[PDB]
Amino acid sequence: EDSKEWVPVTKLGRLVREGKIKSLEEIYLYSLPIKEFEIIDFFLGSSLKDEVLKIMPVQKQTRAGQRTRFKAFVAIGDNNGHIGLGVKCSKEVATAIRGAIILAKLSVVPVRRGYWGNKIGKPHTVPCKVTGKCGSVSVRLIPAPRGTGIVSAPVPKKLLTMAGIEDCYTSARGSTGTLGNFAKATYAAIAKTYAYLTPDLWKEMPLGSTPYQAYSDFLSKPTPRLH
Amino acid sequence: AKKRKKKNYSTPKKIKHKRKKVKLAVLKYYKVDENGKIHRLRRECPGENCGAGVFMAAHEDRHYCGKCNLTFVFSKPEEK
RNA sequence: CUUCCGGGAAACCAAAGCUUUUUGGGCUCCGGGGGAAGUAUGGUUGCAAAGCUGAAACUUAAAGGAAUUGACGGAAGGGCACCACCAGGAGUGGAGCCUGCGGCUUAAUUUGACUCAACACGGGAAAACUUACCAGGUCGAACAUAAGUGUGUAAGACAGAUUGAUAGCUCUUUCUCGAAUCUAUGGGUGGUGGUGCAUGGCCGUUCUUAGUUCGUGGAGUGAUUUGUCUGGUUAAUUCCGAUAACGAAC
RNA sequence: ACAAAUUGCGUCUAGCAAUAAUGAGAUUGAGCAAUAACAGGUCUGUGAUGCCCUUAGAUGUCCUGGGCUGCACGCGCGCUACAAUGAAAGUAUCAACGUGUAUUUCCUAGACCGAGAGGUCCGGGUAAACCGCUGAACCACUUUCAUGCUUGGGAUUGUGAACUGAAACUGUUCACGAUGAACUUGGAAUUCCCAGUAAGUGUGAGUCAUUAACUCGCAUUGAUUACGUCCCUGCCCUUUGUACACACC
Numbered sequence: 066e067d068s069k070e071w072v073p074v075t076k077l078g079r080l081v082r083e084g085k086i087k088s089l090e091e092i093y094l095y096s097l098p099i100k101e102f103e104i105i106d107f108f109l110g111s112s113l114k115d116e117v118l119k120i121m122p123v124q125k126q127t128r129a130g131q132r133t134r135f136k137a138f139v140a141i142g143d144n145n146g147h148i149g150l151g152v153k154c155s156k157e158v159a160t161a162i163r164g165a166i167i168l169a170k171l172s173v174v175p176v177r178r179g180y181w182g183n184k185i186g187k188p189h190t191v192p193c194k195v196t197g198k199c200g201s202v203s204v205r206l207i208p209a210p211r212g213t214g215i216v217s218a219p220v221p222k223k224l225l226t227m228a229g230i231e232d233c234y235t236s237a238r239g240s241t242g243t244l245g246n247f248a249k250a251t252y253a254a255i256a257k258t259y260a261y262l263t264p265d266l267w268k269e270m271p272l273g274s275t276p277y278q279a280y281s282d283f284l285s286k287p288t289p290r291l292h
Numbered sequence: 293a294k295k296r297k298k299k300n301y302s303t304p305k306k307i308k309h310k311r312k313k314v315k316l317a318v319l320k321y322y323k324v325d326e327n328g329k330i331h332r333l334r335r336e337c338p339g340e341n342c343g344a345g346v347f348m349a350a351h352e353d354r355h356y357c358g359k360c361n362l363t364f365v366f367s368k369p370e371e372k
Numbered sequence: 373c374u375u376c377c378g379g380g381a382a383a384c385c386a387a388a389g390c391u392u393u394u395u396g397g398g399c400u401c402c403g404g405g406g407g408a409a410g411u412a413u414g415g416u417u418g419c420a421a422a423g424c425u426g427a428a429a430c431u432u433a434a435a436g437g438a439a440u441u442g443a444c445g446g447a448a449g450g451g452c453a454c455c456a457c458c459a460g461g462a463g464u465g466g467a468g469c470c471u472g473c474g475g476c477u478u479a480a481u482u483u484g485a486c487u488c489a490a491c492a493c494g495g496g497a498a499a500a501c502u503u504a505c506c507a508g509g510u511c512g513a514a515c516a517u518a519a520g521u522g523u524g525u526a527a528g529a530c531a532g533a534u535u536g537a538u539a540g541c542u543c544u545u546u547c548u549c550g551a552a553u554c555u556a557u558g559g560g561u562g563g564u565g566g567u568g569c570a571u572g573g574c575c576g577u578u579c580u581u582a583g584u585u586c587g588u589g590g591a592g593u594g595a596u597u598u599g600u601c602u603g604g605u606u607a608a609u610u611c612c613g614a615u616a617a618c619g620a621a622c
Numbered sequence: 623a624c625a626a627a628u629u630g631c632g633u634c635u636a637g638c639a640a641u642a643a644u645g646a647g648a649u650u651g652a653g654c655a656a657u658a659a660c661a662g663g664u665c666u667g668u669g670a671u672g673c674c675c676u677u678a679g680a681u682g683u684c685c686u687g688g689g690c691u692g693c694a695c696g697c698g699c700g701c702u703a704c705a706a707u708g709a710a711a712g713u714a715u716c717a718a719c720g721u722g723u724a725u726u727u728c729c730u731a732g733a734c735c736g737a738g739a740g741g742u743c744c745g746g747g748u749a750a751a752c753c754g755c756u757g758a759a760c761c762a763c764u765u766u767c768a769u770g771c772u773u774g775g776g777a778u779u780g781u782g783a784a785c786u787g788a789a790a791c792u793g794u795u796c797a798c799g800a801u802g803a804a805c806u807u808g809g810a811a812u813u814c815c816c817a818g819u820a821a822g823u824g825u826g827a828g829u830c831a832u833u834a835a836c837u838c839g840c841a842u843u844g845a846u847u848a849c850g851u852c853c854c855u856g857c858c859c860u861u862u863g864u865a866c867a868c869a870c871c
Binding site: 164 | 381392393394440441442578585586587588593594595596
């Protein structure tokens, strides 16, 4: 049970429901604005499982006398190469925990895995040294050889295992006990793994396809075509 | 035994007995003259309202039937 | 002044940026939580008032950094009712009396409720009853256990005490339907007992106003903001119109 | 008024204008009321109720009683007046919401008696039907009073006469004829309110066997003045400094 057959808001999800896009990288070339979560559940859902981080409370001050609101850090992610982060306020927990997790599907990033010192056999950890600085939280990523697991704080290990890394020397400076920027910066730290020029990438490209033009025929028709 | 804020240990000692039983044995007292006349100790009620099975009291000059203890006062009141 | 498209925790910044990648253009002082304390102790300098100089035992889990929100809490700007006036009116607060309640006192003077929103209220205009108060009385209510045996386990009246009356409630003394075997024992029963700082339910105020709050976004590291307006007009977030989710919902 | 309501259109948008009607310049007042809440109110409304208290010697429960009403004192809510726009006498002659007995004695009329209070007899009415067309008070109309704490004002207190209820004694209320205080407009203060309203002046209803001076509406009589302002105590969210926090207590 779905229970609802997904409707496309935009023509991008119309293209994937027509089956003319079968690649998660196809949006990832031109950074296509994915503002429906159903496409994330179109390609994935297999090996895309979630873990809550906190359920930490806040308060809104009123005329009389308080207002209590909830806030839950959470992280879904494909077990090899993807992760998502997000959070959302709510006046009840069950309104949050079934709703705040939708946002991280808009924050799914391809995680690039790299070698450390030898070019044999399915690169594992990280391309290069990447830091994520966000709000007094500077998680510096340092590549590691085999055996040595993901060393981190006790908290962000559940993010990185559900991203796909195995081996990394990693820390940060500051008050990680103020968790709010901590998990967020790692989401910006791991996202920068495709923002680093590599001499492996010095040959470029066939320079583009733009599937708007490659699939305008289905765009041009006004008929609600199934399949 | 209550719990009140002011009055504790009223004590009128509450001596109201249930039944003394220092008297009034049930009628084992019975004499039968032999062959065959029956003598009825606590001779019965002359009132016809009962079946004369009340064992009317032996008392001072005020006797009474047993089915109702206050009434049937033996004075005797004559009616005319 | 503009916007990072830089940097910061932020306001702010063209350098406070290039101190990012666990980073590097040179050189000097100078800080490591408070308060002890810019105090003592000596030197040094001043004609002096005083300065270059500067600690410690003790004591303390926080002192503050910007920002969001509560103040259309005598603080700015704009708009409303005689729970606010003015223009008044009738009043009460004086008198008499009736009741609210305290205080007083009483065997007991049952008691709830202290601003506005406890105070002719608990409809509370009660002889008793109510009544929860005080003083005399008064009822009996489970069960297996259990032991008389039904030679009366009880239950009722006269009679004179006791009584307020008759209360055989008690009892001097008498007959009596006797059986729920009237049990010491499980424990349940009841209460206008306690606690509104255990609550529920209900109600009052917040409310003669005009406000609340959700799914999309761009604000931002987050708090939460935007929506919900600069104005016009409205009893009105009532509409227009700017129109920065609208289709929002009361 | 069912509003093209005519009106040198205001930021084209909602130009007050009463004015057009001629039941009608709203016929027109309440009820319903959110969001987050507060240690508001109540366990004595309840066989809603946790916990605690008790259970033949009860707080429970029914009887006899008392007391809640007790009074040098503080206070609030209202009525009675402080009289000449009257107190007296009569006379004229006006409502309305309502109201009322079946298994409990209500509403009453009619004759009758009684200073009265009340008492007796025959009725009606389960009610647009009888009470009742409820033929309400204050006013209005000739007088009596001469302003004199006065025939204004009726507290106090005797007395019998009532009557309700088994039962009355800071009291059941009501009668008659005695008794006539305090008080002549009320210190600082402070209440409500803009039209059929305030206020005067009443009736019904509610608690009820009898006890209204309150309470819920009814009805009559019918103002001054406001038709605003943001000072003052208020209050509603826009900028705003803050050490503001359990929010200037």
